[PDB]
Design a binder for this molecule. Structure first.
Ligand code: MQF
Length: 135
């Protein structure tokens, strides 16, 4: 029945963001998309069905959905319209999401901390932290 990844399941709303604009610059997002994407207040809906995890983000800018099995690479179109190759694993209770494209890489870690879901993103040393709470 239950799995350790069940502490991520639910509906989550963004409550704070730090340095996201700079992270998006590093990733290569252009001005207009950065401004509109940075303005978004996404909710994230995380569900599990068997081995398949689904993460949906809903906002006024774009809605995105990925479904995956841990440790099994998939192709993803990101909200900023990159086409990337992604792998997501669980490493000591942290969901680790690596995206690779055009010889570049970025890592997005998701962890439960108290009542929050904390998202830490890094690209070439540029960092962002986004904090979600249950909706
Ligand atoms: O989870 C997040 O809050 C998050 C959210 C977004 C989107 C979701 C839809 C509305 C606009 C922002 C995102 O987009 C990708 C890029 F940032 F590159 F534009 N990246 C991340 C993150 F990097 F942190 F995983």
């Amino acid at each position: 029945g239950s799995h350790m990844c069940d502490a991520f399941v639910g509906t989550w709303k963004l409550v704070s963001s730090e340095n996201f604009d700079d992270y998006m610059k590093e990733v290569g997002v252009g001005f207009a998309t950065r401004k509109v994407a940075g303005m978004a207040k996404p909710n994230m809906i995380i569900s599990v069905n068997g081995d398949v995890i689904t993460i949906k983000s809903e906002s006024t800018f774009k809605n995105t959905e990925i479904s995956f099995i841990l440790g099994q690479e998939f192709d993803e179109v990101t909200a900023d319209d990159r086409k990337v190759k992604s792998t997501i694993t669980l490493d000591g209770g942290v969901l680790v999401h690596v995206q690779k494209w055009d010889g570049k890489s970025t890592t997005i870690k998701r962890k439960r901390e108290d009542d929050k879901l904390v998202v830490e993103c890094v690209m070439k040393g540029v960092t962002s932290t986004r904090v979600y709470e249950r909706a």
